[PDB]
From a paper:
We had noted that the interaction affinity between engineered proteins used for [name]σ:[name] complex crystallization (chicken [name]σ Ig1–3 and [name] LRRIg1cryst) was some 20-fold lower following the [name] 63–77 loop deletion (Kd 4.8 μM versus 216 nM). We therefore explored the possible contribution of the 63–77 loop to the [name]σ:[name] interaction by engineering a construct termed [name] LRRIg12Q, comprising the full sequence but still removing two predicted N-linked glycosylation sites by introducing N68Q and N72Q mutations. This construct did indeed bind [name]σ with enhanced affinity, while [name] TM2Q induced comparable levels of presynaptic differentiation in co-cultured rat hippocampal neurons to wild-type [name] TM. We determined the 3.05 Å crystal structure of this chicken [name]σ Ig1–3:[name] LRRIg12Q complex in an attempt to visualize this additional, fourth, binding site. Crystals grew in a new space group, P1, with three [name]σ:[name] complexes in the asymmetric unit (a.s.u.). The site 4 interface is not well resolved in this 3.05-Å resolution structure, although we do observe an additional [name] helix (formed by residues 69–80), which interacts with [name]σ Ig2 predominantly via potential packing of the I73 side chain against a hydrophobic region consisting of [name]σ residues V144, Y223 and [name] L56, T74 and L101. The [name]σ Ig2–Ig3 linker (V226-A230) and the Ig3 domain also lack well-ordered electron density in this structure. However, a R227A+R228A double mutation reduced [name]σ:[name] binding, as did insertion of the meB mini-exon between R225 and V226 in SPR-binding assays, supporting the involvement of the [name]σ Ig2–Ig3 linker in the auxilary binding site 4.
At the axonal surface, type IIa receptor protein tyrosine phosphatases (RPTPs) (type IIa RPTPs, for example, [name]σ, [name]δ and leukocyte common antigen-related (LAR) in vertebrates, dLAR in Drosophila), are a recently identified nexus for extracellular interactions, receiving signals and transmitting them intracellularly to the cytoskeleton to regulate neuronal extension and guidance, as well as synaptic organization. There are two major neuronal [name]σ isoforms, sharing a common intracellular catalytic region and an extracellular region predicted to contain three immunoglobulin (Ig)-like domains followed by either five or nine fibronectin (FN) type III domains, in the central and peripheral nervous systems, respectively. Previous mutagenesis and structural studies have demonstrated that the proteoglycan-binding site lies on Ig1 of [name]σ, and comprises an extended positively charged surface of basic residues101314. Binding of postsynaptic [name], is reported to require the N-terminal three Ig domains of [name]σ17; the NGL-3-binding site has been mapped to the FN1-2 domains.
Residue numbers in the entry:
A (entry chain B): 31 to 58, 69 to 302
B (entry chain E): 29 to 66, 72 to 227
Write the structure that this text describes.
């Protein structure tokens, strides 16, 4: 079942021998390949100089994954939502690769205990301020790691002391704290996000049984406002928690409104 | 030397709330042009192809009315700059007409050895009888540029005759007609190699 170069356990894939290959491990009965890949809790690539990119397709089979390590290899970038289907993934080691940048949104569904980003060729930018922030608040063990980024003039700055102006977490407001509505009537809530860069904003409210419409009120610079309208409200949505989120490249904030219907 | 011309002009899309809509544009000329679509959001993803001379605007999950709009693809090189438009309409689940495309069977996870045949499955219904097209990794699959290796089946499936490393990816079928457009949930094709 195991691909060559690697040593495959029942719950472990280790590919530490040097390798010119650029294809993520694929064990090899479409029902069986899924079953075998579930039981894997730990993948460890190392010294794969030509492994440049990591797709979501590569990861999606390994649903039981808890530990991913792609160390000291050629890794340039990770496709968005790569780790979507790897919910148990908590230890990630991406040190020693060719990463110039990295998005927090890769890890938005995960509860990372340890994210290792040491010795990558990071370039200073707003795109990586989130790392600086995680580092400050002691998130995912970045606080212990010594991380630098590089300015265009080749200056190497410690990440703690990165200074990018107009590059902050978004702030978020909502028109109502809680919401009371009579069954059959309509209702309007407005959520706005503000900051730099200008955050996207969304009412993550799909599980709602009622009919609902979303409309952008403003997109002036620095404020983004969206207006959730609930039409002909069913009482099946009593006690539902309407949540709005505002994200930019720095991070994410949210607000919650309790909906009560009678 | 030659200014930019559009060989793929994007077409209007009537999508359904919660689902997906794609717009495709692609330009050509000398020098090679760079195309581009016109707030930064996970729901709006631009996928580039052909060294940036083509680009697909993928919008998902669709929200209404907010996403409804005219969108602009702009091809540009040293000799010119040209623009094409396309509209997005987004119907709610309750607002869908009776004959709005519906995916009755979507594609499924498939693994296949290199050089073997692999057929990704799709079956759709609606009125008019919907026309089916495929999308591999958010870009549209073009059976004519194979050539003869990849075949669009009558029933709607996609037949890939000689499996290749490049054929691996996330496939999804798209049923569409005058009433609108509906995406299947996605399915991955893996290609084992030795
Ligand atoms: C994986 O582990 C489960 C545990 O119940 C077992 O039933 C199954 O046979 C195993 N499959 C493989 C591929 O080892």
């Amino acid at each position: 079942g195991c691909p060559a170069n690697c040593l495959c356990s029942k719950t472990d894939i280790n590919c530490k021998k040097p390798d010119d290959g650029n294809l993520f491990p694929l064990l090899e009965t479409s029902i069986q390949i899924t079953d075998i890949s579930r039981n894997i809790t730990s993948i460890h690539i190392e010294n794969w100089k030509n492994l440049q990119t990591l797709n979501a397709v590569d990861m999606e089979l390994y649903t039981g994954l808890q530990r991913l390590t792609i160390r000291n290899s050629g890794l340039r970038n990770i496709q968005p939502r790569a780790f979507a289907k790897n919910p148990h993934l908590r230890y990630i080691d991406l040190s020693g690769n060719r990463l110039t940048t990295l998005s927090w949104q890769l890890f938005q569904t995960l509860r990372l205990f340890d994210l290792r980003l040491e010795r990558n060729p990071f370039q200073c930018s707003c795109d990586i301020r989130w790392i600086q922030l995680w580092q400050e608040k002691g998130e995912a063990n970045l606080q212990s790691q010594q991380l630098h980024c590089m300015n265009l003039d080749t200056a190497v700055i410690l990440l703690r002391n990165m200074n990018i102006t107009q590059c902050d977490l978004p702030e978020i407001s909502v028109s109502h704290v809680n919401l009371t509505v009579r069954e059959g009537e309509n209702a309007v809530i407005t959520c706005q996000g503000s900051g730099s860069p200008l955050p996207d904003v969304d009412w993550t409210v799909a599980d709602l049984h009622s009919i609902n419409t979303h409309q952008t009120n403003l997109q002036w610079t620095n404020v983004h406002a969206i207006q959730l309208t609930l039409v002909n409200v069913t009482s099946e949505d009593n006690g539902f928690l309407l949540t709005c989120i505002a994200e930019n490249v720095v991070g994410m904030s949210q607000a919650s409104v309790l909906l009560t219907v009678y | 030397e030659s200014p930019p011309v559009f060989i793929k002009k994007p077409v209007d899309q009537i999508g359904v709330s919660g689902g997906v809509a794609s717009f495709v544009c692609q330009a050509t000329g000398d020098p090679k042009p760079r195309v581009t679509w016109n707030v930064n959001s996970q729901r709006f993803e631009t996928i580039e192809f052909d060294e940036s001379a083509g680009a697909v605007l993928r919008i998902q999950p669709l929200r209404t009315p907010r996403d409804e709009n005219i969108y602009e693809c702009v091809a540009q090189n040293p000799h010119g700059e040209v623009t094409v438009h396309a509209k997005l309409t987004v119907l709610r689940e309750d607002q869908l007409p009776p004959g709005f495309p519906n995916i009755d069977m979507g594609p499924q996870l498939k693994v296949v050895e290199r050089t073997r045949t692999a057929t990704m499955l799709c079956a759709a219904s609606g009125n008019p009888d919907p026309e089916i097209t495929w999308f591999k990794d958010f870009l549209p699959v073009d059976p004519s540029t194979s050539n003869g290796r990849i075949k669009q089946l009558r029933s709607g499936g996609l037949q890939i005759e000689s499996s290749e490393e490049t054929d691996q990816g996330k496939y999804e079928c798209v049923a569409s007609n005058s009433a609108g457009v509906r995406y299947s949930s996605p399915a991955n094709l893996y290609v084992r190699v030795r």
